[PDB]
Amino acid sequence: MENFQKVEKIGEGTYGVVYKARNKLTGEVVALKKIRTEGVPSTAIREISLLKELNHPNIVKLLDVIHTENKLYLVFEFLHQDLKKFMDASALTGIPLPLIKSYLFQLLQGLAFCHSHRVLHRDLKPQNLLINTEGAIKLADFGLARAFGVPVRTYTHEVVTLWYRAPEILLGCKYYSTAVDIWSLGCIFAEMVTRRALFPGDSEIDQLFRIFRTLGTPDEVVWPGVTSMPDYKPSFPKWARQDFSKVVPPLDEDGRSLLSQMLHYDPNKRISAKAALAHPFFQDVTKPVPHLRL
Numbered sequence: 001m002e003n004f005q006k007v008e009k010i011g012e013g014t015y016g017v018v019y020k021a022r023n024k025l026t027g028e029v030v031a032l033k034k035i036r037t038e039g040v041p042s043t044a045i046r047e048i049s050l051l052k053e054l055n056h057p058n059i060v061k062l063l064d065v066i067h068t069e070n071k072l073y074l075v076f077e078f079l080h081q082d083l084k085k086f087m088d089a090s091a092l093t094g095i096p097l098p099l100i101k102s103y104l105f106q107l108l109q110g111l112a113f114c115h116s117h118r119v120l121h122r123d124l125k126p127q128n129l130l131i132n133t134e135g136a137i138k139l140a141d142f143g144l145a146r147a148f149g150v151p152v153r154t155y156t157h158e159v160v161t162l163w164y165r166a167p168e169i170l171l172g173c174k175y176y177s178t179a180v181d182i183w184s185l186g187c188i189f190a191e192m193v194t195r196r197a198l199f200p201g202d203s204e205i206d207q208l209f210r211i212f213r214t215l216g217t218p219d220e221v222v223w224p225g226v227t228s229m230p231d232y233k234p235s236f237p238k239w240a241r242q243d244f245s246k247v248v249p250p251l252d253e254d255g256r257s258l259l260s261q262m263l264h265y266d267p268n269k270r271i272s273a274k275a276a277l278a279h280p281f282f283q284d285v286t287k288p289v290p291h292l293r294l
């Protein structure tokens with residue numbers, strides 16, 4: 001805008017371009033997101049505005065929502081790096097388990113908070129998990145999906161990742177629950193551990209089948225109601241479930257146990273963020289500081 005000073009382009013978001021900017025007045029450095037559109041649904045304005053009150057240490061703070069010239073700018077707290085960049089940078093030696101655990105623990109606190117205030121993320125991915133030099137990790141873009149539907153592309157040619165999408169979403173369920181975020185986080189947890197995406201689908205069906213090939217094709221036994229879901233097809237191949245120890249080696253049994261509960265097919269059986277925080281996997285949780293090259 002005019003009150004800022006575009007420091008640099010932080011890239012293209014899932015709605016619009018994002019700039020690192022400095023408030024000419026407060027002097028604070030922020031992340032400015034330009035959201036796609038001819039008028040901007042006031043329903044979305046109200047929704048988005050409610051999020052300015054969703055404040056938690058593990059949630060990227062939404063500082064301001066500015067609707068002007070029928071344009072929508074979201075002003076966010078700035079963090080220097082995202083988990084996707086950090087995982088790539090740690091790819092050779094992998095992120096230490098104490099840090100993986102700290103991050104997972106903080107992310108779960110963030111989800112617990114959001115979920116208790118009835119706010120879902122719906123599109124969690126390494127790219128929207130931001131970290132700082134103090135060992136903190138925070139969830140970015142919470143609640144935006146609900147206030148901006150679900151578009152195939154960002155808004156202008158760009159393939160949205162399906163890798164972290166919950167199976168109920170892929171089977172066409174129309175009502176999402178807090179469980180979709182636990183699923184995405186489980187996928188992210190597995191990726192930090194193995195240093196490779198758990199389910200790197202390149203199409204919705206490839207995503208679904210990759211999930212099926214690893215966790216077994218779901219049936220009425222493990223997921224009551226699954227065969228009645230909108231996109232379920234009796235013709236889906238039936239793959240047997242793979243041993244978990246083969247999925248995220250060499251994670252210990254505490255870790256494997258928690259991951260398995262975060263990846264339960266039935267959204268209802270899937271562990272909640274609150275319950276997850278009490279899992280024995282976090283018994284020795286600490287807050288290490290990462291090695292960040294900025």
Ligand SMILES: NC(=O)c1cc([N+](=O)[O-])ccc1NCc1ccccn1
Pocket residue numbers: 010011012013018020031033060076077078079080081082130140
């Ligand atoms: N809120 C933010 O700080 C932020 C926002 C978005 N975004 O797309 O909304 C993307 C990245 C961010 N920071 C990480 C970062 C910042 C600068 C250089 C490298 N990496």
